[PDB]
């Protein structure tokens, strides 16, 4: 079956350079045009590049003009995209799409087959471990009813961190939050859980955070005040 | 240059309903628009091309229509799997591809007011020196809510950040956290801190306060 | 400088259907959203429903879902709230309201007076 | 049910009021004497001017036999048919009741009555001409709608309709001819007294039910259906030619905009409207007339790829090669289409005016025929109830339901059945 595989994403510094690769299985790049479309985190799709391997008809968007470069190889059936002097707003997930040629249905069919798409981010700061802090519920905050426990993790890079409650024992009524970028360029996240009365279960609630690139295992305790 | 204005920036439709999404082209782009489906975390899959033709593989629920410079996607039946983001693309040429802003089709639900809570900082923060106060809204269906921070009835701007979860699986609800960060030199200024929430399910804004 | 008037209701026998209207003067409501709220003794100031503009739809509460319907016409500047299966515990006054934020934050700045309703 | 003053010897076909050997009276059916005189004078007054106008139309035909081509030739057979109709209806006024009436005889104690049957009377010939040419005129209007259809959907000229003229005459004198021989075979000829002619569907309910009113209703349905089909097929092919003209003029004007322009920006901003116009023009449309737009779009593609690479004069040289492709395939197709689609506009306007000026009298005649169809039993019952003592027949038992029909309705029916010949003059002069 015809398919596309993207590779090359990772952490890069501002002003750096990166080369993404899109490999095709099935069709040939000489019979189809290959496009790159980027999606910023929390935003919509915008077209960033395209290539026609039949003759070479490269053109880009106005946001990346004079800053990106696209090419293709027919021997390895691949398309490469190179970015030099990356700005901080170029962090996105990049998707590889296939578009046919005039005339007929192949052109009228738009981007038909899309790759998995790989994520590139602009690393303003190097890696560091998360700091796990408690969010102590107030004693008078709905005494005898449902009260919220929580752990706030701050100042961790890169993005993927996993927060678990009692090694996954409590899963009902939990809410982990999508991480946000601070003004310092660092990541923050909060995890909350609502438990009813019972002196909050009279057990030491724990937050086990997993941050693999910093290989941290901070299993913190949260207690009422 | 050619701009596609996709009007209903967020739709809320239930199972089996009929969904209409519109897209307006600035220029007189011919019947070359494509409607795309994107599930959260994956790549777009083509639904409709040439403004009328269904793709080989997509169900016959989807259909497209063109009226001059207006383009419409109609989903006759809304299966639970058809809850994704839908995009409008004009393709007049390879180098002119401009997308729409996108419509997030969410699940309609009975409106519930948020259960707001506020957390004071910790001793670990004052050992660190960066005070963070968090105020969370729990289980409110319409996402259009807001929260303001009061420091002795004073408004603060630019120092609060909001994080909102996507719609849940069981109850199809939301959860939001507003975090305000101060330095300790900026912490003991005034004595009380309040977070007030306004939501369409709440008549009067609900305030949660704590003194220092 | 803007006012909103409400009508309908009164002393209604149980099980019936009504149609309570609400019309605003002093400002066009082609770019705003209205809402209906309920105030009862014991449990004060409950929420009923919200009507948006033409692009969006209409949203309802939990104890009123399915048995109500909210509609809106912008030429005459009127919004309608409908009743069905009116169980007689709704001995409460009904309030129309208008949102003061175009981004639907629900900020209520022009409430009105509220039409009283008595069932049984 | 028939008095001694109204009884005839048998086996002559006389059938009035569903009883053998009876016939309606000649001078008075239920109207006044002065009212009948005024109605007869009014019929003669319209008849003389109708004969004059229709004879003017036939003289206009006679001054040049090839003046009207076959897309509009059936209007002159329409004119001659309705000139014979008006001539018969004027003969009715001139001859009063000397033809479509039997004579009285005091010695036999019989009264003047309606001729109904063969006998040896010119009323047979009058029925032949009147019914034949009325049905023929209606069928000729149907044929005119057919000829407009042949000039609308399977677009023909004044040659292909000529090659079907023998079959057209065969129909337009065959359905009226066969219907006339059927009605003469079944002995359903009757006689007027108001006007002075002979016709079918006057004192028999079924003859007016499905041998006069039903054929005219079928003709109207067929004609309106064919007219609406022509209108839809002409205004689909008009607006689909209108947008293709708009797509082509926004391509030709923009090609001039490109040619006398500068900079690397407006060459792209103008060519991007060319490509959008070319794709929509391809959708309108034969295989060579879609492959041509296919190679034009690719020619815009070759011009647009040079413009993106910041080459301005090469886009001028690439766009100027579109002029050869336009002349080689289209641009003679438009003024040939705008002529065949604007003589058809004016033909459609004339046939619409003719239809809206002829159908309304025809629809009035259909309505009055329906009115005479409905209340036949009530009218005859009122006749019997009012005319009982002087005819010595037993009076009706019950159900009076007094209803004397109005002179206005029947005079309208005799009025709009003759003004239909006036509609030719508008096309003649």
């Amino acid at each position: 079956e015809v398919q596309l595989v993207e590779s090359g994403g990772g952490l890069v510094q501002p002003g750096g350079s990166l080369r993404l690769s899109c490999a095709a299985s099935g069709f040939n790049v000489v019979d189809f045009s290959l496009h790159w479309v980027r999606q910023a985190p929390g935003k919509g799709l915008e077209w960033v590049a395209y290539i026609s391997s039949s003759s070479g008809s490269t053109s880009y968007a106005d946001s990346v003009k004079g800053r990106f470069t696209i090419s293709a190889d027919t021997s390895k059936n691949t398309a490469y995209l190179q970015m030099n002097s990356l700005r901080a707003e170029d962090t996105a997930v990049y998707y590889c799409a296939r578009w046919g040629y005039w005339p007929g249905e192949p052109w009228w069919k738009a981007f038909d087959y899309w790759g998995q798409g790989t994520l590139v981010t602009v690393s303003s700061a190097s890696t560091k471990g998360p700091s796990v802090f408690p969010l102590a519920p107030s004693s008078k905050s709905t005494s005898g009813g449902t009260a919220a426990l929580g752990c706030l993790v701050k100042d961790y890079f890169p993005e993927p961190v996993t927060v678990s409650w009692n090694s996954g024992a409590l899963t009902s009524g939990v809410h982990t939050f999508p991480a946000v970028l601070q003004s310092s360029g660092l990541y923050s996240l909060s995890s909350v859980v609502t438990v009813p009365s019972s002196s909050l279960g009279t057990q030491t609630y724990i937050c086990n955070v997993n941050h693999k690139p910093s290989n941290t295992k901070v299993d913190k305790k949260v207690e009422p005040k | 240059d050619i701009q596609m204005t996709q009007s209903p920036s967020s739709l809320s439709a239930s199972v089996g309903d009929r969904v209409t999404i519109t897209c307006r082209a600035s220029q007189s782009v011919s019947s070359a628009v494509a409607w795309y489906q994107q599930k959260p975390g994956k790549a777009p899959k083509l639904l409709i091309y040439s403004a009328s033709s269904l793709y080989s593989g997509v169900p016959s629920r989807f259909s497209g229509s063109r009226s001059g410079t207006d383009f419409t996607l109609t989903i006759s039946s809304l299966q639970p799997e058809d809850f994704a983001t839908y995009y409008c693309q004009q393709y007049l040429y390879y180098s002119l591809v401009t997308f729409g802003q996108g419509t997030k089709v969410e699940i309609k639900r009975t409106v519930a007011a948020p259960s707001v809570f506020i957390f004071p900082p910790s001793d670990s923060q004052l050992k660190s020196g960066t005070a963070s106060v968090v105020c969370l809204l729990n289980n409110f269906y319409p996402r259009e809510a807001k929260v303001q921070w009061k420091v002795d009835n004073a408004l603060q701007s630019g120092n609060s950040q909001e994080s909102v979860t996507e719609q849940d699986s069981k109850d199809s609800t939301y959860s939001l956290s507003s975090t305000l960060t101060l330095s300790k030199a900026d912490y003991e200024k005034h004595k009380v801190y309040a977070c007030e929430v306004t939501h369409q399910g709440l008549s009067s804004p609900v305030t949660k306060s704590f003194n220092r | 400088q803007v006012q909103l008037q409400e009508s309908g209701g009164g002393l209604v026998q149980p099980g019936g259907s009504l149609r309570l209207s609400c019309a605003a003067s002093g400002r066009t409501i082609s770019r705003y959203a209205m809402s209906w709220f309920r105030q009862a003794p014991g449990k004060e100031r409950e929420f009923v429903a919200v009507a948006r503009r033409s692009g969006d739809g209409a949203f309802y509460a939990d104890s009123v879902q399915g048995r109500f319907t909210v509609s809106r016409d912008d030429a005459k500047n009127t919004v309608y709230l409908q009743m069905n299966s009116l169980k007689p515990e709704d001995t409460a006054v009904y309030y129309c309201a208008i949102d003061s934020d175009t981004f639907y934050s629900g900020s209520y700045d022009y409430w009105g007076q509220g039409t009283q309703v008595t069932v049984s | 049910w028939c008095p001694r003053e109204l009884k005839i010897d048998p086996d002559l076909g006389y059938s009035f009021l569903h009883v053998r050997d009876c016939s309606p009276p000649c001078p008075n059916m239920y109207f006044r004497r002065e009212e009948l005189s005024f109605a007869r004078y009014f019929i003669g007054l319209i008849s003389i001017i109708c004969l004059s106008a229709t004879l003017f139309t036939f003289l206009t035909f006679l001054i040049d036999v090839t003046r009207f081509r076959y897309p509009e030739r059936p209007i002159i057979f329409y004119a001659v048919c309705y000139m014979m109709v008006s001539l018969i209806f004027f003969i009715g006024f001139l001859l009063e009741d000397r033809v479509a009436c039997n004579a009285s005889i005091p010695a036999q104690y019989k009264a003047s009555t309606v001729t109904q049957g063969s006998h040896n009377k010119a009323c047979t010939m009058l029925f032949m001409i009147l019914y034949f040419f009325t049905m023929a005129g209606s069928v000729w209007w149907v044929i005119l709608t057919i000829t407009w259809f042949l000039a609308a959907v399977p677009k023909w000229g004044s040659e292909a309709i000529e090659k079907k003229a023998l079959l057209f005459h065969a129909s337009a004198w065959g359905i009226p001819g066969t219907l006339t021989i059927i009605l003469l075979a079944m002995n359903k000829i009757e006689g007027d007294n108001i006007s002075g002619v002979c016709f079918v569907g006057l004192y028999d309910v079924d003859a007016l039910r499905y041998f006069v009113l039903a054929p005219l209703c079928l003709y109207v349905v067929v004609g309106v259906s064919l007219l609406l089909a022509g209108i839809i097929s002409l205004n689909r092919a008009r607006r689909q030619l209108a947008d293709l003209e708009d797509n082509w003029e926004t391509l030709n004007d923009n090609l001039k905009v490109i040619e006398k322009a500068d900079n690397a920006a407006q060459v792209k901003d103008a060519l991007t409207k060319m490509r959008a116009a070319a794709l929509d023009a391809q959708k309108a449309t034969m295989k060579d007339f879609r492959h041509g737009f296919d190679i034009l779009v690719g020619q815009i593609d070759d011009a647009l790829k040079l413009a993106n690479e910041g080459k301005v004069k090469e886009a001028q040289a690439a766009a100027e090669q579109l002029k050869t492709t336009r002349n080689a395939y289209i641009q003679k197709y438009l003024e040939r289409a705008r002529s065949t689609l604007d003589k058809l506009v004016k033909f459609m306007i004339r046939i619409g005016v003719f239809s809206i000026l002829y159908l309304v009298p025809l629809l009035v005649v259909i309505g009055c025929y329906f009115y005479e169809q409905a209340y036949r039993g009530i009218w005859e019952t009122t006749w019997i109830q009012e005319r009982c003592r002087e005819y010595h027949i037993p009076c009706p038992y019950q159900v009076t339901q007094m209803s004397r029909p109005d002179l206005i309705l029947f005079l309208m029916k005799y009025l709009m059945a003759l003004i239909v010949g006036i509609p030719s003059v508008f096309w003649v002069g």
Side-chain angles (χ1 to χ4, degrees), chain A residues 1-158 160-219 221-225, chain B residues 1-38 40-41 43-212, chain C residues 1-30 32-75 77-120, chain D residues 1-3 6-31 36-40 42-44 46-95 97-108 111-119 122-124 126-384 387-388 390-396 403-429:
Chain A
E1 179 86 351
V2 287
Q3 67 105 32
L4 288 163
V5 176
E6 295 113 327
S7 297
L11 311 167
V12 286
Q13 300 297 112
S17 181
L18 196 150
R19 185 200 199 81
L20 295 88
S21 61
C22 175
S25 166
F27 51 85
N28 284 264
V29 288
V30 296
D31 216 359
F32 283 96
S33 60
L34 286 201
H35 293 227
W36 282 91
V37 179
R38 74 163 160 196
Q39 185 171 333
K43 286 200 202 74
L45 290 172
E46 70 176 2
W47 168 84
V48 79
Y50 95 102
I51 176 65
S52 161
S53 302
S54 79
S55 63
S57 304
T58 284
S59 65
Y60 312 100
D62 299 328
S63 295
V64 300
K65 178 79 91 193
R67 199 167 37 115
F68 284 24
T69 293
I70 198 167
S71 67
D73 179 73
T74 66
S75 70
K76 302 173 279 203
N77 223 351
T78 41
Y80 302 86
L81 199 147
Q82 179 72 246
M83 302 104 77
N84 297 293
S85 86
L86 279 165
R87 288 201 274 283
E89 61 266 36
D90 303 342
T91 174
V93 53
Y94 278 78
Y95 291 116
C96 189
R98 171 201 81 171
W99 194 5
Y101 275 119
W102 198 248
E105 294 293 327
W107 180 96
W108 280 106
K109 287 177 182 176
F111 306 136
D112 264 338
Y113 284 77
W114 297 65
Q116 334 291 309
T118 179
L119 159 78
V120 61
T121 181
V122 172
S123 311
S124 85
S126 180
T127 178
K128 72 177 292 296
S131 68
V132 185
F133 281 170
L135 300 176
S138 298
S139 58
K140 66 191 71 62
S141 178
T142 73
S143 300
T146 61
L149 276 297
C151 42
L152 165 58
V153 292
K154 289 178 70 67
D155 305 342
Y156 62 95
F157 183 80
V161 71
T162 287
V163 179
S164 57
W165 277 92
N166 288 136
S167 79
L170 278 83
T171 310
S172 66
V174 73
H175 283 301
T176 184
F177 279 109
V180 297
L181 278 173
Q182 293 293 321
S183 65
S184 50
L186 283 83
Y187 266 111
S188 194
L189 186 145
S190 313
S191 179
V192 286
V193 59
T194 45
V195 298
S197 168
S198 71
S199 72
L200 309 177
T202 185
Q203 98 259 21
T204 316
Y205 271 118
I206 81 173
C207 276
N208 201 4
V209 304
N210 288 320
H211 185 206
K212 273 80 68 178
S214 65
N215 53 88
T216 61
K217 204 63 180 173
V218 189
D219 194 10
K221 314 288 186 291
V222 56
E223 290 91 1
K225 282 185 178 184
Chain B
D1 191 23
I2 292 175
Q3 185 181 2
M4 308 299 281
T5 72
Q6 197 175 7
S7 184
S9 178
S10 185
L11 286 90
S12 311
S14 197
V15 195
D17 219 358
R18 181 185 187 85
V19 168
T20 289
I21 302 170
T22 179
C23 191
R24 160 155 286 273
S26 74
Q27 290 191 4
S28 179
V29 176
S30 178
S31 89
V33 301
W35 292 91
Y36 282 83
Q37 177 178 0
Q38 173 179 29
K45 295 182 293 297
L46 194 144
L47 297 202
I48 291 172
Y49 71 98
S50 180
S52 297
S53 64
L54 271 302
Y55 185 57
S56 304
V58 300
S60 186
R61 307 191 295 265
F62 307 96
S63 66
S65 160
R66 180 210 184 195
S67 178
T69 63
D70 292 317
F71 311 97
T72 315
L73 157 62
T74 62
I75 318 175
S76 308
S77 169
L78 203 65
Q79 292 307 104
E81 64 185 2
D82 290 351
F83 276 136
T85 314
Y86 293 80
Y87 285 98
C88 165
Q89 167 181 349
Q90 59 96 16
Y91 54 106
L92 209 56
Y93 183 47
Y94 295 173
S95 83
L96 261 56
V97 172
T98 66
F99 289 93
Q101 288 303 128
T103 76
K104 276 82 175 175
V105 179
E106 310 154 356
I107 317 182
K108 190 190 283 291
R109 181 206 161 75
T110 79
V111 173
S115 310
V116 69
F117 309 95
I118 183 163
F119 290 102
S122 64
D123 303 355
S124 63
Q125 297 187 1
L126 64 92
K127 278 191 292 291
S128 178
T130 302
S132 174
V133 55
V134 68
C135 191
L136 78 157
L137 282 69
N138 212 318
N139 293 275
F140 63 99
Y141 160 69
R143 196 204 271 96
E144 298 90 6
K146 74 171 165 56
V147 53
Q148 297 150 355
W149 285 93
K150 298 283 101 174
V151 187
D152 272 332
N153 306 86
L155 175 75
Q156 275 74 19
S157 296
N159 42 358
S160 50
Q161 269 189 315
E162 297 178 344
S163 179
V164 54
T165 73
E166 212 50 50
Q167 205 168 6
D168 212 329
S169 63
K170 295 184 288 294
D171 47 356
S172 63
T173 57
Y174 292 76
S175 306
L176 194 142
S177 77
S178 66
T179 292
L180 182 132
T181 52
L182 302 179
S183 72
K184 293 323 209 284
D186 208 6
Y187 181 44
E188 279 85 6
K189 57 98 176 179
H190 311 84
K191 188 255 290 181
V192 302
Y193 296 91
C195 54
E196 51 184 359
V197 55
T198 74
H199 181 226
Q200 280 197 336
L202 285 167
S203 60
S204 173
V206 177
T207 67
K208 280 317 186 63
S209 305
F210 75 104
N211 46 357
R212 165 71 186 170
Chain C
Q1 61 267 62
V2 64
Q3 292 291 322
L4 72 161
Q5 312 294 319
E6 54 271 14
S7 70
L11 180 60
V12 193
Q13 57 169 2
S17 156
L18 285 85
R19 194 261 302 162
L20 297 97
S21 314
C22 169
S25 49
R27 201 188 313 288
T28 175
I29 322 292
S30 66
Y32 303 92
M34 272 150 181
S35 43
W36 275 106
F37 273 69
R38 190 207 285 146
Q39 195 156 4
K43 44 180 186 293
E44 278 77 58
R45 187 69 75 184
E46 200 178 2
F47 158 73
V48 170
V50 167
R52 281 152 147 75
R53 51 178 86 93
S54 159
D56 292 330
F59 293 98
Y60 316 97
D62 200 282
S63 65
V64 310
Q65 173 53 270
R67 37 174 292 265
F68 286 177
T69 311
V70 195
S71 64
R72 161 153 149 141
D73 61 301
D74 53 351
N77 191 7
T78 317
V79 290
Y80 302 134
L81 180 77
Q82 194 259 7
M83 303 291 113
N84 176 24
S85 178
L86 190 60
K87 210 179 166 64
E89 78 266 8
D90 307 343
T91 50
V93 301
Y94 276 37
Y95 272 84
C96 192
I98 178 66
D99 200 3
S100 68
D101 197 4
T102 61
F103 299 139
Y104 286 5
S105 157
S107 308
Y108 294 146
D109 287 327
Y110 299 104
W111 266 102
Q113 291 285 321
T115 38
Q116 68 272 13
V117 166
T118 308
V119 187
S120 80
Chain D
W1 284 38
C2 206
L6 216 66
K7 183 181 75 173
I8 320 100
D9 50 345
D11 69 90
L12 260 59
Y14 274 134
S15 69
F16 182 39
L17 312 155
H18 296 142
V19 62
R20 182 62 64 192
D21 304 338
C22 196
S23 176
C26 166
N28 188 3
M29 57 307 294
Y30 35 73
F31 286 126
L36 279 171
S37 192
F38 160 69
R40 173 162 81 84
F42 183 71
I43 288 312
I46 186 178
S47 308
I48 177 168
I49 190 167
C50 280
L51 206 48
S52 85
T54 49
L55 256 63
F56 167 64
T57 63
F58 196 42
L59 277 180
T60 307
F61 184 41
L62 286 176
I63 206 166
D64 209 335
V65 292
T66 177
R67 181 83 56 86
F68 290 76
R69 295 300 302 157
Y70 216 84
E72 69 196 6
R73 180 65 67 87
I75 206 164
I76 201 64
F77 295 140
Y78 167 102
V80 71
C81 287
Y82 282 120
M83 96 175 191
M84 303 308 283
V85 177
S86 173
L87 170 61
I88 297 310
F89 264 121
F90 191 32
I91 288 176
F93 161 67
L94 294 157
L95 269 160
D97 68 297
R98 309 160 35 88
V99 175
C101 274
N102 289 113
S104 308
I105 166 69
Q108 288 318 296
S112 61
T113 196
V114 175
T115 297
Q116 209 167 2
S118 45
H119 296 88
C123 168
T124 301
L126 281 186
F127 157 65
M128 295 285 308
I129 171 165
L130 186 59
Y131 184 64
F132 191 35
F133 280 92
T134 289
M135 298 327 279
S138 200
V139 174
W140 273 123
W141 178 84
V142 174
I143 276 184
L144 185 45
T145 59
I146 278 184
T147 55
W148 185 56
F149 183 86
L150 295 185
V153 173
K155 295 181 178 65
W156 285 349
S158 66
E159 287 315 296
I161 321 176
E162 281 279 330
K163 262 171 287 158
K164 299 296 292 296
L166 175 61
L167 192 144
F168 282 170
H169 284 104
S171 66
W173 309 100
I175 316 85
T178 45
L179 271 155
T180 313
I181 208 67
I182 282 171
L183 275 162
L184 190 66
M186 293 197 290
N187 202 353
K188 294 183 182 291
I189 188 185
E190 286 177 349
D192 265 316
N193 304 320
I194 295 171
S195 77
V197 307
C198 286
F199 196 61
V200 66
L202 277 169
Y203 295 141
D204 183 32
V205 55
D206 57 83
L208 200 56
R209 195 190 271 146
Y210 43 85
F211 272 51
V212 175
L213 187 51
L216 292 193
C217 279
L218 158 73
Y219 297 158
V220 167
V221 166
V222 161
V224 169
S225 179
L226 278 153
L227 276 166
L228 284 171
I231 291 292
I232 289 158
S233 183
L234 198 43
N235 280 321
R236 270 185 290 177
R238 182 199 281 182
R239 77 191 203 185
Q240 70 103 16
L241 179 61
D243 56 58
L244 190 148
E245 171 83 13
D246 294 356
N247 295 357
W248 207 89
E249 66 97 18
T250 198
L251 199 147
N252 179 49
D253 294 326
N254 195 280
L255 184 55
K256 297 174 66 74
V257 163
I258 292 155
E259 188 72 28
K260 55 210 194 278
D262 49 352
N263 210 46
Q266 49 260 42
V267 288
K268 321 193 308 185
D269 201 29
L271 269 155
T272 182
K273 281 185 292 293
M274 302 262 298
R275 179 144 169 142
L279 293 178
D280 196 81
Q282 174 157 356
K283 299 313 280 179
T285 195
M286 195 180 66
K287 308 303 291 289
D288 59 329
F289 301 122
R290 199 198 305 144
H291 200 264
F293 274 123
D294 207 351
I295 209 74
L296 186 83
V297 164
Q299 203 79 88
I300 300 183
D301 194 0
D302 299 358
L304 204 43
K305 60 197 207 71
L306 294 159
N308 267 328
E309 280 152 32
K311 299 190 183 287
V312 290
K313 61 174 68 174
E314 297 292 326
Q316 308 286 76
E320 68 97 21
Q321 288 184 357
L322 271 77
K323 304 202 211 73
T324 50
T325 46
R326 291 152 58 251
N327 198 359
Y329 283 93
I330 294 76
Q331 173 69 296
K332 53 218 164 296
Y333 169 56
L334 268 304
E335 75 265 12
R336 171 229 70 89
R338 256 290 188 278
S339 288
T340 45
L341 188 145
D342 294 330
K343 63 182 71 174
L344 257 71
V345 176
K346 80 208 184 63
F347 184 36
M348 164 184 41
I349 289 300
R350 287 175 294 177
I351 195 60
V353 166
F354 181 83
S355 287
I356 207 65
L357 197 146
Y358 160 75
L359 273 176
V360 176
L362 188 50
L363 285 186
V364 162
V365 169
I366 278 154
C368 206
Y369 278 162
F370 268 112
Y371 289 160
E372 212 275 340
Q373 172 59 221
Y375 322 106
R376 81 287 185 275
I378 304 172
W379 283 335
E380 297 299 328
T381 298
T382 50
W383 187 338
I384 298 159
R387 294 201 210 279
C388 195
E390 68 267 16
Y391 288 162
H392 292 46
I393 78 166
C395 291
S403 190
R404 180 170 285 235
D406 63 285
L407 179 139
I408 297 303
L409 264 186
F410 279 180
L411 262 291
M412 270 312 188
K413 182 248 286 186
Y414 283 178
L415 177 70
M416 299 298 170
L418 281 178
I419 211 77
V420 286
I422 299 309
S424 55
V425 182
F426 144 80
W427 198 304
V428 162

